[PDB]
């Protein structure tokens, strides 16, 4: 029964990197005792990410080990720290070390590195890993001292070669009782073994299991090109996120606030941009503490920017527009905004936000800052879809890939603050990180690589984690791919691609309340129901689009109305077919008019078929009235599109058999009445101005 | 200027026949002075209708003329009387006689009769008639005496030959100044000249014009086979019927009544026979004075006769049924009934009435008797058609023909009492005529000729006029030709052939009042109208016909109802298609339901299309209810066919959105409600008995 107080973990760290700090938390979770070598020093160990090196680790260990050269009572484990997490206790570790019968147990690995020719000198192992890895080892302090004291090489000579040569000395191997952890009982090196490692869950703890060997490793080493797979595992192992605990290092449940540089990017035609700009004024962060930079690459959006710039300029403490005439690429524009923050010591946080990011959570900026990370993005998804502003995994050549937990995250079955290889569209970056760790100008530019990926790789290459919070609902992602801007009002056509935003803009704000009851729907005449349907903006834009087309009806035009046996009852009008809006209006019918009708006429069921959908214009100088008639419809929908009094004078609809008149219609409100038999009706004369009406003959 | 007081008309008449009396009225109209020879005597003049004869006329004239043998101051005209009418005044006659320059002017005619060989001895006339006719002549009494005194022949030698021989004596012709009225200036003989004679009308008088010669004859002689054309002209000339006077010899404007023998004849299957028998009880003639004979040749009608015979027997003073088992032909049956009257001196009038005669005028029998004719028929027509119970003219071989005034009579543009060659279906014949003038038994039988024609020819052969009154509305003629008796209730199928009777029997007695307003139509629930439609007899017979078929619906049966999205909402029922009544019911829809709907829903128009027309049966032991649903119809018609309380217990129809229930439906009344959208409805459970309902989904 070895005493855990006789175990000492020694690692090397020249800076307190996120990886190093991640290592310590996993150590502190299990009450390990950790000595860190090298914390102030310059790394002279070479480019371990690109080649051989790391001898400086040994040189430092050798010096440290002179204290313990005679301490047979002490067990020491050496591990890297940037790319290591601990998954089990000192008790289970010492139990396993004893069971190995070794005096110094090195980790094992699939590759004979860095001299592939030496493989033949290694003992033949069966199904186990055959070669030594210096990223982790454990043994008596005396034995370890007898190995490392032999170090006499350059700081950038390779440490693993050095240990390999001593391991392959057969007399030394036998005399000192050196061994390798062939079956990853203690040490799990990820390189060459990704398909052997899976997460093993418990109530308040997560581990890894090697499925090749059915073991539960103590130490997870993301050596070589497996740092990002280790990032993934470190989100869980050992207490990153547990089924019963939730995340462990998150802010969980939520006086001058830091000064923020808010940069808005508009790099494609984007729907609902006026709405986005108006939202900037509502973000719950003191505007004297925010300075706004907006890059617009779209001539399409210049009027939209101009309309709201007076308000933005009055709102924030400083504003700057970079417009299409500067001919900046998105890469150059994002480098510029970020560098404007970098070069201002007063810029404490940098907040990048693309025009397709809809932030429903007004406290987003505060929430992200309070998480206190170098880089953190709020999770944003396409409504009801799996597409989102991050990636959970990378392909072998650093392209897109789907992590095994991606759906769990997007669906918020697992919520927390995740270490992911790619984020986009919104993120908050610490000013000091820009100054001290990513000082270059070419963050997004410099290669043919697309900027959004260049950005993420810049941070990954420095070992800066890219964090992603799905801890709260933050907002959504607008669809922008096939946005048709060849309309007077393109957002009218957005009904299929952005239905949630389309409804917020164009459906009446009180529709849903009226659909749910609450005494809003009225019945002005027998079986004629009256409810709010269209917002004023929808009315205005639809009329506008109609006049912009301009081809109103005239003589010899025929509608589906029935009067006086067989006569011709026409209106001056434009059908949806003509302006290319029929599919759109039919969707509004299926989605919003169908369910209201079924609720007002219990027992009736509808798919909201309608062949005749047209806007009617009334004027005293062309066609001011519409004589008594019936409609070819089961029911008729009649929506007012402008204001009685303001835009026209004169009455509206009259139902003759009920001697009931709808005078004073309401803009955006719709009448619902039967089309046949009972509700013979006429449109009263418009006496001044112009009357606009939207009508569909449903279920003909 | 010859003095009319010096003119004397002499004719011959052995009996005061209708023709003779007709002659006198035309004479009295113009104030002629007429001496009649032969009134008491037996006619020994032969068969003038069949051969030569008439010498007795001359013998009597010769005797008469000895008084006037020297009276040069006197002008005498001889004419027949049975077949003669006068059309002009003695003044115009004497004026024309003088203008002829003759001393004795004989009528002229187309045929050299009765010795065709004598034609060559006659003077050549141009376009005029070339030969003598003894039916009319006029001359000085001295000259006429010198001609007739030569008569010394047999009573049945031919008189016209006798005058012809004296005319063809050229010396006598010259010496006595004998002439013929070649151009019908005074005398118009009809035989051989029918196409020369037309009626010429004046305000209060009618004449004839010869169009060959452009003359206005004084004397119209229907000689030979032209008695019936003369009958026709005598209806008008001279004061029979005038444009401003109407008829002249009619009863125009209307204490034991004569005893009548009423004979009813049923010689084919006849629709609405129960109704006809019931009508017999309503004829406004004291039933103690009527004795009823009914011949039925139809086993089809035996139950109908049996049902009402108790009532008939109690009503009239004596009744007699002759039924199918006696195997009488209609001819033998009509001979029998008529002979029962003939042989009863107490039978003062005989009234024959066929089963297809609908007498709407209850005072018919009185009206006909008060006209005081030997034989008289009320005018009866097919509703709205030209077909009627008389003929105005005969073909050359005594078959059917259409008189030139036939349409004027049927349409009652000319009303009066007409002398026509054929009557049928109803007529009143004087008992004394049967006894004294038509004593034979074989009136209708005896030849292959059909009885209806044999009857008329029997009377015509005796010179008895067949009179026809269109002076009042008397009734109508049922159509019987293609009556289908292969139904439990054949009169249900009579909708197309006898619509007026069908409506009186099967349409509700208060329908038309309700169609016209008058607060009968109710609106028990919003836009559900309630009106009387079917009589109780129609309800009973339709249900009966339905059960007689018996093939009610069951499982897997599908109707055009809409509920709960897509589900199966069926009834236990029989569609009209199945019992062969759909065309019928569709007509009832077009004729009675269409117009009511258009009046209750102003602005709506209908041809009353309906694919689904079915009777529903409700019972607690099969299908007692009908769950909430909509109908595939613009509007639905729902007619109750039996009595709540008497035939069933339990509620009826409920309209869910109006929380309005039609409990207690009315037998024969119909609901009218929209089929779609607003009027979701269910049929409440029938809890005792059986519920029958008639339903059509109109305008699907
Ligand atoms: O020198 C080593 O220890 C190993 O480095 C690489 O493999 P790798 O595990 O990916 O190296 P890292 O884990 O990225 O860095 C090695 C350790 O050196 C320390 N280090 C490294 C770099 C640095 O700037 N500061 C610093 O403290 C960290 O503990 C770091 O984990 C080489 O491929 C191995 O052959 C070599 O044995
Ligand atoms: O004897 C005649 O006077 C003529 O009778 C027929 O021609 P029609 O004019 O048709 O004879 P009717 O008019 O039917 O009868 C002749 C007249 O005799 C009188 N008459 C005849 C029959 C009779 O039973 N009682 C009677 O009084 C009537 O005035 C009767 O009109 C013959 O065809 C002629 O040749 C003949 O000249
Ligand atoms: C949506 O419904 C709200 C609640 O009834 C409406 O609100 C009122 O607006 C009137 C004038 O516009 C004010 O005088 C009231 O004080 C408001 N009431 C509340 C509770 O805020 C609102 O007008 C409706 N929206 C539209 C577009 O009609
Ligand atoms: C047709 O309408 C008449 C008039 O309203 C109905 O007549 C009444 O019938 C009730 C009972 O049947 C009597 O008590 C009233 O005295 C009647 N009124 C008159 C004015 O006669 C008649 O019932 C209706 N016919 C049907 C078949 O419903
Ligand atoms: C770590 O040590 C503390 C005593 O300072 C003890 O209370 C705690 O339970 C230990 N945690 C574990 C996981 O052993
Ligand atoms: C017939 O004679 C009477 C006199 O008795 C005379 O009043 C009447 O006008 C005459 N009618 C005609 C038509 O001459
Ligand atoms: O002017 C109105 O409100 C009635 C017009 C109407 O209902 C129609 O389009 O047929
Ligand atoms: O039982 C009733 O009165 C309602 C039945 C009905 O309307 C139907 O035939 O669909
Ligand atoms: Fe139109
Ligand atoms: Fe309309
Ligand atoms: Fe059915
Ligand atoms: Fe129904
Ligand atoms: Mn490492
Ligand atoms: Mn004659």
From Swiss-Prot, chains A, B:
2-oxoglutarate binds at residues 561, 618, 638, 691. Changing residue 676 to N: Loss of dimerization. Loss of lysyl hydroxylase activity and no effect on glycosyltransferase activity. Changing residue 112 to I: Strongly reduced glucosyltransferase activity. Strongly reduced galactosyltransferase activity. Fe cation binds at residues 629, 631, 681. This is Multifunctional procollagen lysine hydroxylase and glycosyltransferase LH3. Changing residue 631 to A: Strongly decreased lysyl hydroxylase activity. No effect on glycosyltransferase activity. Glycans are attached at residues 31, 510. The keyword Manganese applies. GO terms for biological process: basement membrane assembly; collagen fibril organization; collagen metabolic process; endothelial cell morphogenesis; epidermis morphogenesis; hydroxylysine biosynthetic process; in utero embryonic development; lung morphogenesis. It comes from the Eukaryota.
């Amino acid at each position: 029964p070895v005493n855990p107080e006789k175990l000492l973990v020694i690692t090397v760290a020249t800076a307190e990197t996120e990886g190093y700090l991640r290592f310590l938390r996993s150590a502190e979770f299990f009450n390990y005792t950790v000595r860190t070598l090298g914390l102030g020093e310059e790394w002279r160990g070479g480019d371990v990410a690109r080649t051989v090196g790391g001898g400086q680790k040994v040189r430092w260990l050798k010096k440290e080990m002179e204290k313990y050269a005679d301490r047979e009572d002490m067990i020491i484990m050496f591990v890297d720290s940037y790319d290591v997490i601990l998954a089990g206790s000192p008790t289970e570790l010492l139990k396993k070390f004893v069971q190995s019968g070794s005096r110094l147990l090195f980790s094992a690995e699939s590759f004979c590195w860095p001299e592939w020719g030496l493989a033949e000198q290694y003992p033949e192992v069966g199904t186990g890993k055959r070669f030594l890895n210096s990223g982790g080892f454990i043994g008596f302090a005396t034995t370890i001292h007898q190995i490392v004291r032999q170090w006499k090489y350059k700081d950038d000579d390779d440490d693993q070669l050095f240990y390999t040569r001593l391991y392959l000395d057969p007399g030394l191997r036998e005399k000192l009782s050196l061994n390798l952890d062939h079956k990853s009982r203690i040490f799990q090196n990820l390189n060459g073994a990704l398909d052997e490692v899976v997460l093993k869950f418990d109530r308040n703890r997560v581990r890894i299991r090697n499925v090749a060997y059915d073991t539960l490793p103590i130490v997870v080493h993301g050596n070589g090109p497996t740092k990002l797979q280790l990032n993934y595992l470190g989100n869980y192992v050992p207490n990153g996120w547990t089924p019963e605990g939730g995340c462990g290092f998150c802010n969980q449940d939520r006086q001058p606030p830091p000064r923020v540089f808010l940069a808005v990017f508009v790099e494609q035609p984007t729907p609902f941009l006026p709405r986005f700009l108006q939202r900037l004024l509502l973000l719950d962060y003191p505007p004297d503490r925010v300075t706004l930079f907006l890059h617009n690459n779209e001539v399409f959006h210049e009027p939209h920017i101009a309309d709201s710039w007076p308000q933005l300029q009055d709102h924030f403490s400083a504003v700057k527009l970079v417009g299409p005439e500067e001919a900046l690429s998105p890469g150059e524009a994002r480098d510029m905004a970020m560098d404007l923050c970098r070069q201002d010591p007063e810029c404490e946080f940098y907040f990048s936000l693309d025009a397709d990011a809809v932030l429903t959570n007004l406290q987003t900026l505060r929430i992200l800052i309070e998480e206190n990370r170098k880089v953190i993005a709020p999770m944003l998804s396409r409504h009801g879809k799996l597409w989102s502003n991050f990636w959970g995994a990378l392909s072998p050549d650093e392209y897109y890939a789907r992590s095994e937990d991606y759906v769990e995250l997007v669906q918020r079955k697992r919520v927390g603050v995740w270490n992911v290889p790619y984020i986009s569209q919104a993120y908050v970056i610490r000013g000091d990180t820009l100054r001290m760790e990513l000082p270059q100008r070419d963050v997004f530019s410099g290669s043919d690589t697309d900027p959004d990926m260049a950005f993420c790789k810049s941070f990954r290459d420095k070992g800066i984690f890219l964090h992603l919070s799905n801890q709260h609902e933050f907002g959504r992602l607008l669809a922008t791919s096939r946005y048709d801007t060849e309309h007077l009002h393109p957002d009218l056509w957005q009904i299929f691609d952005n239905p949630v935003d389309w409804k917020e803009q164009y459906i009446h704000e009180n529709y849903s309340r009226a659909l749910e009851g609450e005494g809003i729907v009225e019945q002005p005449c027998p079986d004629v129901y009256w409810f709010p349907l269209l917002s004023e903006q929808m009315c205005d834009e639809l009329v506008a689009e109609m006049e912009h087309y301009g081809q109103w009806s005239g003589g010899r035009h025929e509608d589906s109305r029935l009067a006086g046996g067989y006569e011709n009852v026409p209106t001056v009008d434009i059908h949806m077919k003509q302006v290319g809006y029929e599919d759109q209006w039919l969707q509004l019918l299926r989605t919003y008019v169908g369910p209201m009708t079924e609720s007002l006429f219990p027992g009736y069921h509808t798919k909201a078929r309608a062949v005749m959908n047209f806007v009617v214009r009334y004027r005293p100088d062309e066609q001011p009235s519409l004589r008594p008639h019936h409609d070819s419809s089961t029911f008729t929908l009649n929506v007012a599109l402008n204001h009685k009094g303001l835009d026209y004078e004169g009455g509206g609809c009259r139902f003759l058999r009920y001697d009931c008149v709808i005078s004073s219609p309401r803009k955006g409100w719709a009448l619902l009445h039967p089309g046949r038999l009972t509700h013979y009706h006429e449109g009263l004369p418009t006496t001044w101005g112009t009357r606009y009406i939207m009508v569909s003959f449903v279920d003909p």
